[PDB]
Amino acid sequence: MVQAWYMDESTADPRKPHRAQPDRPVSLEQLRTLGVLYWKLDADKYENDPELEKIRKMRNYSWMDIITICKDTLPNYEEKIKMFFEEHLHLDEEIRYILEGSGYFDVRDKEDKWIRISMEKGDMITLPAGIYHRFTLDEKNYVKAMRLFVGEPVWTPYNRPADHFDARVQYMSFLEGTA
Numbered sequence: 039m040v041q042a043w044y045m046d047e048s049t050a051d052p053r054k055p056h057r058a059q060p061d062r063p064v065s066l067e068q069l070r071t072l073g074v075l076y077w078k079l080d081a082d083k084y085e086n087d088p089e090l091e092k093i094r095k096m097r098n099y100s101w102m103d104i105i106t107i108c109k110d111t112l113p114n115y116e117e118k119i120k121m122f123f124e125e126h127l128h129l130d131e132e133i134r135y136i137l138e139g140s141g142y143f144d145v146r147d148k149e150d151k152w153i154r155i156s157m158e159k160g161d162m163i164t165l166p167a168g169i170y171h172r173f174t175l176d177e178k179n180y181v182k183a184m185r186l187f188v189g190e191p192v193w194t195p196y197n198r199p200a201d202h203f204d205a206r207v208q209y210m211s212f213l214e215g216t217a
């Protein structure tokens with residue numbers, strides 16, 4: 039089962055689990071109140087999976103590619119890794135389906151406290167436009183992820199503060215409507 043938790047107060051070593059003590063787990067239902075949605079798939083089948091196709095058609099995920107984050111293969115690795123972990127938002131959904139390996143997507147809750155989401159092979163997530171978030175590898179230091187997009191992609195991050203954007207305003211309005 040996909041795991042998420044409130045983070046501790048240490049600012050060192052982003053790749054460690056950083057579980058708050060005592061444990062404060064976060065449920066998929068609480069994540070939905072933040073607009074964060076999740077599906078579980080068989081990642082071995084990703085090249086030809088009717089279940090993935092059902093989600094892509096439902097959600098209008100008409101575009102995809104594959105990215106591999108590995109200290110060796112990935113160009114500008116050190117710079118990209120730093121960028122990924124900077125708190126930012128996008129004006130579009132951020133949709134990621136983990137094909138191999140694992141990593142952490144952190145999101146702000148309604149009180150602007152960090153929640154860490156542990157994503158592993160088979161896990162698919164969408165972070166809504168406007169949500170403040172960041173990504174890091176975990177201590178296994180490897181992930182292969184499918185990126186999906188509603189139409190032709192724009193990857194631009196806006197590092198916090200980015201509060202003026204319509205996407206952020208609309209997201210804040212969405213938050214008023216959930217539990």
Ligand code: NI
Nearest residue numbers: 128132171195
């Ligand atoms: Ni992002």
